[PDB]
Design a protein around this ligand. Structure first.
Ligand code: FES
Length: 127
């Protein structure tokens, strides 16, 4: 699915990288409309995966805390590292992933069913 920014515009990779500083984590509309983080890597390239921002506890949207490099849920305090791996409950699972690719200049999110690269476990979201 083509990623859309907060204003409803398709995310055009080359343009996104001009206005989003390296290390940036900004929410976009991802698979099934779920808020998904598009991340600009250290070397000024888009990360190859998107992080679904829907908390695994009750579904609040988790913001990124740049100071601590953690996504911290304002609803009940669940914490996740910078790759979305769960670090503190009540959420029992890591934030879901999506593959991030570019098609005809547009950023597209695609389902992630391969091994959860963060732990070696099968993705819990793809069954
Ligand atoms: S909805 Fe995220 S801590 Fe409960």
């Amino acid at each position: 699915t083509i990623a859309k920014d907060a204003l409803g515009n398709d995310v055009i990779a080359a343009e996104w990288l001009k206005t989003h500083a390296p290390g940036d984590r900004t929410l976009t509309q991802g698979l099934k409309g779920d808020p998904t983080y598009l991340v600009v890597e250290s070397d000024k390239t888009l990360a190859t995966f998107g992080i679904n921002a829907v908390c695994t506890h009750l579904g609040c949207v988790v913001p990124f805390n740049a100071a601590e490099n953690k996504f911290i849920c304002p609803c009940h305090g669940s914490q996740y590292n910078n790759q979305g791996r769960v670090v503190r409950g009540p959420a029992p699972l890591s934030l879901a992933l999506a593959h991030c690719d570019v098609d005809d200049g547009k950023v597209v999110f695609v389902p992630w069913t391969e091994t959860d690269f963060r732990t070696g476990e099968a993705p819990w979201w793809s069954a």
